[PDB]
Amino acid sequence: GSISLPSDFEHTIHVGFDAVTGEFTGMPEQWARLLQTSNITKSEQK
């Protein structure tokens, strides 16, 4: 056995269009923080 096809798979961060400020939503913790910081406006209310 050499190459094997992936088994696992799960939609971790689903980025979408954000009219709020011509930006995206649900921005990944890294993506968001990279430029912005809040995945969705204010990340999330823990």
């Binding site: 056995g1 190459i3 992936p6 939609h11 979408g16 921005m27 990944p28 430029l35």
Partner: protein, 184 residues
């Protein structure tokens, strides 16, 4: 132990979410939303060596020029896909999406993809397909085009059915494998 993150550029089945969806996890999309990034989980064992890959979706122009540093062109090989039957997208994706390959990876290889065996149905397509002298594009035709442009080479079919995705994965993970050298 080295990371593998293939970047994608384009729309209408570009290999980003379309591939992993069926070509990998099989399961189809869930929440319909402009895949600006979308994350995924996978582990390809090359020669018996677990790994952590992820299809990094992107564009390279529409609000991505700023969100590019997050994808880092050096991430790995480029994953691109394009319709098969519908030729209106074939030519386009070529001189339309390829140009972007440099926007996100001006010095990084790019892998093209063409699958659409279940989408086929529109008759008008064939009628025109005869005008382009391309004929009913198939899972093989896509490869031919890739040969002309010269790339990492790929081979695969459309969702639902499976002809042999393990192959394209061997070349998709091999090119990025980057045989580590004994450097101290």
């Amino acid at each position: 132990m080295q990371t593998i993150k293939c970047v994608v550029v384009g729309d209408g089945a570009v290999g980003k979410t379309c591939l992993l969806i069926s070509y990998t996890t099989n399961k189809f999309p869930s929440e319909y939303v402009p895949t600006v990034f979308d994350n995924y989980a996978v582990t390809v064992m090359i020669g018996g060596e677990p790994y952590t890959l992820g299809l990094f979706d992107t564009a390279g122009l529409e609000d991505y020029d700023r969100l590019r540093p997050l994808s880092y062109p050096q991430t790995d090989v480029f994953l691109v896909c394009f319709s098969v039957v519908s030729p209106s997208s074939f030519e386009n994706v070529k001189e339309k999406w390829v140009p972007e390959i440099t926007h996100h990876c001006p010095k990084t290889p790019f892998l093209l993809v063409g699958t659409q065996i279940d989408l086929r149905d529109d008759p008008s397509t064939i009628e025109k397909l005869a005008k382009n002298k391309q004929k009913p594009i198939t899972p093989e035709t896509a490869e031919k085009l890739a040969r002309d442009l010269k790339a990492v080479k790929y081979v695969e079919c459309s969702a639902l059915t499976q002809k042999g995705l393990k192959n394209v994965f061997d070349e998709a993970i091999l090119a990025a494998l980057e045989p580590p050298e004994p450097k101290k």
